[PDB]
UniProtKB/Swiss-Prot annotation, chain A:
It catalyses: TSAVLQ-|-SGFRK-NH2 and SGVTFQ-|-GKFKK the two peptides corresponding to the two self-cleavage sites of the SARS 3C-like proteinase are the two most reactive peptide substrates. The enzyme exhibits a strong preference for substrates containing Gln at P1 position and Leu at P2 position. This is 3C-like proteinase nsp5. 3CL-PRO exists as monomer and homodimer. Only the homodimer shows catalytic activity. Interacts with host FBXO22; this interaction promotes the proteasomal degradation of nsp5. It is found in: Host cytoplasm; Host Golgi apparatus; Host nucleus. Residues 1-299 are cytoplasmic. Changing N140A: Does not affect ability to cleave and inactivate human TRMT1. The chain holds residues 3266 to 3564 of 4405 of the full protein. There is a cross-link at K3, K88 (Glycyl lysine isopeptide (Lys-Gly) (interchain with G-Cter in ubiquitin)). Residues 1-299 form the Peptidase C30 domain.
């Protein structure tokens, strides 16, 4: 059981390099539009209090340099959708796959194609943290890197990297420029919220361990929802909901372990601990596997 | 604050994966130029697997017994040859999406990306390291045989691994693209026991050097040890012995920082005897050993 990322081939052919003045970052080329963060029109000293509306008036089409490998594209017009700059080019991308723009919720997983200057360099699987950030490795030059899921033939684009927070974590928008969490695209002191553990993902991971055969944590006891939340809130675990129980329903059925029975095992691991044991070869409780991920990778 | 283990982008490998069917057995193949490489146990049934006479089985097959599909395009097999534990199927059509490629044989401790495929279709990609017992603990289900491992340097894909067998320990075993197994394993349904898995000491040391470069320094101590003394303690914790070659490879890292290698070795021993004490190193609660020194020296 390892974190598998989606194959990136469909998204690799959509990455381009966008240059405005001295700023160079990554863009997404779909049909005849290049999507990129709007702070590409800003200098490093404009980022204090940027008035993006005035800044876009004073640019023109020739100020943007779109670089598709070695072929240049002519920006034939430009527009702005809340935090994302949409550059209309003269050439349609022949590699455009079946795609959709979606907005995911906290706790959901996706793959990220880390790119630098329009060149893909790595891919990894990650989850939306409950504080609206993501744990990534975007050292420097990876703004405009995108996150995605693949459904049969459809690539669902759900994330675009915009900023790197000083904690180590990173913040970004969806493809419509709506930006996850209480962040703005300004250089100012922005603090990420209080990061909690995705409880429903932990339970799905515990079900995965039972499927593989690691069953030492199973007990005879069962708890209630209301009792479990007090224990979970104390240990900074997201309150489990009834919908969470229904989502874990299919896993609860084959394992034979009810969600509230498995919750009683989780309570023991929270309070007493592993007691010098390992689950799936880990002394730590993993929370970046959604129930759907466990079903995809196991059944 | 954090190394996250990235895999290489898989696009160039995705266009080379095909489906090979012989009888009732279906597995994955690699299509390069005009050859499809795949494990030779595709010509076996479940009965043959305990004691297979591969040359008896292959001598009885014809070209039309091999069905190769690249998506919906049927590939027409015009010849076949066996190189060690791999079958080379010659087809009439060259793969139009063949990248610039190389075949390399890796050593234990080296890392690569694996493209997990199921009956001709890519499913997922992950990064792993060749363990010192010549196995990989990846995520392989039934029907992933023929999935390959690779590294990308500029535009050259280095194919280094092909999945062949799953061991009862839960780990996986395979060959290089020339058909030579990694480790003392055979393509036979017998009691094949993997060796003891040990931590890759040189990889942990390179990762610790990355930590001091970023700013994690709380684990440093004011002692130094000899290589012989360090290895004596290391084997007690199931760590691989450190050689003089490992010390030279870490040399640039010790030059970039101020800490000598044997100085770093004394800190590692202290971590082993005390544990983590609840703190983290590059946002990790465990000593991590799947980062090669070459990667650290690059992505500083």
């Amino acid at each position: 059981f390892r974190k598998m990322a989606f194959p990136s081939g469909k998204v690799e052919g959509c990455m381009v390099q966008v240059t405005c003045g001295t700023t160079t970052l990554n863009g997404l080329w779909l049909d005849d539009v290049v999507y990129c963060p709007r702070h590409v029109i800003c200098t490093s000293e404009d980022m204090l209090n940027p008035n993006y509306e005035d800044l876009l008036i004073r640019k023109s089409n020739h100020n943007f340099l779109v670089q598709a490998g070695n072929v240049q594209l002519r920006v034939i017009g430009h527009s702005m959708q809340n935090c994302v700059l949409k550059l209309k080019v003269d050439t349609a991308n022949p590699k455009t796959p079946k795609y959709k723009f979606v907005r995911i919720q906290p706790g959901q997983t996706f793959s990220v194609l880390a790119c630098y200057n329009g060149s893909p360099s790595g891919v990894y699987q990650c989850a939306m943290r409950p504080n609206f950030t993501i744990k990534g490795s975007f050292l420097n030059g990876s703004c405009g890197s995108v996150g995605f899921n693949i459904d049969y033939d459809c690539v669902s684009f759900c994330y675009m990297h915009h900023m790197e927070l000083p904690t180590g974590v990173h913040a970004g928008t969806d493809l419509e420029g709506n930006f996850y969490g209480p962040f703005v695209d300004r250089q100012t002191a922005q603090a990420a919220g209080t990061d909690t553990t995705i409880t429903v993902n932990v339970l799905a991971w515990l079900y995965a361990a039972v499927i593989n055969g690691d069953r030492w944590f199973l007990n005879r006891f069962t708890t209630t929802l209301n009792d479990f939340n007090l224990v979970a809130m104390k240990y900074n675990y997201e309150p489990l909901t009834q919908d969470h129980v229904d989502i874990l329903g299919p896993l609860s059925a084959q394992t034979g372990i009810a969600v509230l029975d498995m919750c009683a095992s989780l309570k023991e691991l929270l309070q007493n601990g592993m007691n010098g044991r390992t689950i799936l070869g880990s002394a730590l409780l993993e929370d970046e596997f959604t129930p759907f991920d466990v079903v995809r990778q196991c059944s």
